[PDB]
Amino acid sequence: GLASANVDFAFSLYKHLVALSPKKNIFISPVSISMALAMLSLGTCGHTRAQLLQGLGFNLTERSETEIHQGFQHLHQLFAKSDTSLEMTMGNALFLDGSLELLESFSADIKHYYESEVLAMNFQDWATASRQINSYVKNKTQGKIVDLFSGLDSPAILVLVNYIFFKGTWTQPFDLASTREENFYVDETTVVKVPMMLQSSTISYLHDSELPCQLVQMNYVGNGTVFFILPDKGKMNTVIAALSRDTINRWSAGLTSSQVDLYIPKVTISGVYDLGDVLEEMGIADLFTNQANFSRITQDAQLKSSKVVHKAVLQLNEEGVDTAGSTGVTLNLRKPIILRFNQPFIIMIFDHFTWSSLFLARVMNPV
């Protein structure tokens, strides 16, 4: 199923990304990356197609591709539904150079399954081109995601874009008057001052006995839900390595209503990731080679993928969360329990309804 494959991609992408930069704050939106690369797969063939879909985790021996795109159409559709549009939006776009014309079926497919806009662009003028697209993404994410492509790209004739924006409200908001500056212990040799939020509430709590960590689950107004995982000091990678469907399943069953003095910091983090190295570690490599099969994009031209970029922002306050994420792919011609989050921790934001991993975080430093 889609929900299982997507989250396994989420955790796998997360684990691999964690290993590449062990001191940086890590914040990503897995569903954005999965929908974008799946939309890209519509224009791929041969070994490139098979390798991509397999990297996203779908078994193309027990599952058709139409089913997959039918699967992402269903999610894209559900993240439009009236009761979630106010708090969540997701969308796709295709930017195309005038020298190229899409095959009827490709442009028809991206419009049917992904509701993608296809917009003409003059890529010969890349300064203008990255300006048009960055603002487009800027606007679609209400200004949270700024300058997605940056000046350090060689020009490219096709750009596939996906964006996600999410604004949730705590069912149990933190106490506004209670926020104070506390110590957040970043390393054994690095200490920072951070705004620490506080609430004393009945909260879902679990001290894990099989893993060196403690965790809480909080819901948002709507269908949003979030996990906060605090590993024991120096056990961050043991908890990350254990992140799977089986662990969160075991956690959900273990979470019990408890009295908690909950201290979480006001996190404002962002991250920019070239997912080239990350994706090829996951086995998605043919896209970038001069043997790339993009024959379903257009009739005549050989296309390869030049760049895959993800950008995401996180804001945490007493009232809620404000998150945004974007992926782009460039193609070229071939008694109360005291729980204190004053050290590195994990954030996992999910949707109760679809189980889509919306946002994953490794907070090394919350400032």
Ligand X SMILES: C[C@]12CCC(=O)C=C1CC[C@@H]1[C@@H]2[C@@H](O)C[C@@]2(C)[C@H]1CC[C@]2(O)C(=O)CO
Task: Kindly indicate which of the ranges 23-31, 133-141, 303-311, 347-355 contains the residues binding ligand X, using the contact rule CB under 6 A.
Answer: 347-355
Q: What is the per-residue binding string for ligand X in 192-231, x denoting contact by CB under 6 A?
A: ---------------------------------x------
Site for ligand X contains 23 (CB under 6 A): no
How many residues make contact with ligand X (CB under 6 A)? 12
**CA 229 – CA 12 distance, rounded (Å):** 17
Q: How many CA atoms lie within 13 A of 49 on its CB side?
A: 14
**180 vs 352, beta carbon nearer ligand X:** 352
Site for ligand X contains 36 (CB under 6 A): no
**80 vs 255, beta carbon nearer ligand X:** 255
**CA 287 – CA 292 distance, rounded (Å):** 5
**CA 254 – CA 208 distance, rounded (Å):** 8
Near ligand X by CB under 6 A: residue from 95, 123, 350, 359: 350
CB 364 within 8 A of CB 24: yes
Start-to-end C-alpha separation, the chain: 38
Task: Kindly indicate which of the ranges 2-10, 106-114, 123-131, 290-298 contains the residues binding ligand X, using the contact rule CB under 6 A.
Answer: 2-10
Site for ligand X contains 13 (CB under 6 A): no
Phi, psi angle pair for 20, to nearest 5°: -75, -35
Residues whose CB falls within 8 Å of the CB of residue 184, separated by 6 or more in sequence, listed in order: 191, 192, 193, 194, 196, 265, 342, 343, 365, 366
Structure tokens at 141: 């994410």
Task: Kindly indicate which of the ranges 59-67, 123-131, 281-289, 349-357 contains the residues binding ligand X, using the contact rule CB under 6 A.
Answer: 349-357
Site for ligand X in 231-250 (CB under 6 A): 245, 248-249
**1 vs 151, beta carbon nearer ligand X:** 1
352 is in an annotated binding site: yes
For the CB of residue 126, give the shortest distance to ligand X in the complex, in Å.
40
**3 vs 301, beta carbon nearer ligand X:** 3
For the CB of residue 349, give the shortest distance to ligand X in the complex, in Å.
10
Chain mean position to CA 231? 22
Three-state DSSP class for 193? strand
For the CB of residue 241, give the shortest distance to ligand X in the complex, in Å.
17
**30 vs 320, beta carbon nearer ligand X:** 30
What number of other Cβ atoms are within 10 A of residue 128's Cβ? 12
Near ligand X by CB under 6 A: residue from 7, 275, 308, 321: 7
Concatenate the DSSP letters of all residues of 312-345 into one string: EEEEE-SSEEEEEEEEEEEEEE---EEEE--S-E
Q: Indicate the helix (H) or strand (E) that contains 11.
A: helix 2-20
Site for ligand X contains 353 (CB under 6 A): no
355 is in an annotated binding site: yes
CB 165 within 8 A of CB 89: yes
69 is in an annotated binding site: no
What number of other Cβ atoms are within 10 A of residue 108's Cβ? 11
**219 vs 237, beta carbon nearer ligand X:** 219
For the CB of residue 356, give the shortest distance to ligand X in the complex, in Å.
8
**CA 121 – CA 119 distance, rounded (Å):** 6
Could you say which DSSP state residue 111 is in? Answer: H
Site for ligand X in 248-307 (CB under 6 A): 248-249, 252
310 is in an annotated binding site: no
Binding site for ligand X (CB under 6 A): 1, 3-4, 7, 225, 245, 248-249, 252, 350, 352, 355
Annotated binding-site residue numbers for cortisol = 217, 249, 352, 355
